[PDB]
Amino acid sequence: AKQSMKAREVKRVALADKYFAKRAELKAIISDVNASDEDRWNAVLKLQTLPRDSSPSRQRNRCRQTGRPHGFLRKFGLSRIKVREAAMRGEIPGLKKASW
Amino acid sequence: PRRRVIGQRKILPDPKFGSELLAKFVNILMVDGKKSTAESIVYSALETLAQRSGKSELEAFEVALENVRPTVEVKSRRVGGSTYQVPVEVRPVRRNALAMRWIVEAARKRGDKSMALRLANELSDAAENKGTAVKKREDVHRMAEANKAFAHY
């Protein structure tokens, strides 16, 4: 991946933590069944004001060694290509070629 | 196959009657591996056939087979020039396999209500040399008749 595209994910990860608690209580109000009808309205309008990059749904898992946005595997944090290279070098504990 | 390494597989006899002959007929009738659904269809048709005649379920079934079993068939044979449909003797086992397959195929083509009734009407006509299956056995014997000259290829 391009350098710029890699730096876009570190920003989105930082902004998702700085506004983490401030985002959760706003949705507590909006999802609150027995709140009122105008603070709900205010909480809805206030959630749109936070930067978009603060929502965790804006993040895209990337290969931690190349930046590849496809073929990701969460257990290793790597794309399918780098998982294979490390597995054959014996750099992933317990991981071997399977056969049953 | 080229190597001829194909033996034989054992087939369990049918529950109600303990006839391996009848158990194969359930297999030919079965679709999608739903064997119990085929066992019921055969048993119902066999009882309608048992009360439509005086014989037991088996003896009425054999009489149906005897009128559908082909004795001689034609197989192609490409030799130096062209291909002739050579009449060949049908081996005893293939006689039963063809008879059952034609019965099940004929009954599936009818227009009665259930398949148990369709199979019953085919097994009954087969006792009287009527309907399809029996006619299919006639068309095969005719073809093998018109090619008797080629009985050495």
Binding site: I30, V33, R40, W41, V44, L45, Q48, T49 | -
Partner: protein, 84 residues
């Protein structure tokens, strides 16, 4: 569609734009990129110019446009038929 327990959505920057112009006689077209905003029962009258990707197209908000989003009135793709 959007859950009823959340109320229709409206982009806050547009909600200020209609407020500052309903109280006044501003009949100038409102230029917005907010195709996701539900049309509310408060701007039946003036013309919002909605973005379609490459320009702003004016829609004259009437009553029967209430409940629809703005984008439903600004088609994004240009089609005229094949070999027509």
């Amino acid at each position: 569609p959007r859950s009823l327990k959340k109320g229709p959505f409206i982009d806050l920057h547009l909600l200020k734009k209609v407020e500052k112009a309903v109280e006044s006689g501003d009949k100038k077209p409102l230029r917005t990129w907010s195709r996701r905003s539900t049309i509310f029962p408060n701007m039946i009258g003036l013309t919002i110019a909605v973005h379609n990707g490459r320009q702003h197209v004016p829609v004259f908000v009437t009553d029967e446009m209430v409940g629809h989003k703005l984008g439903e009135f600004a088609p994004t793709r240009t089609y005229r038929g094949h070999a027509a």
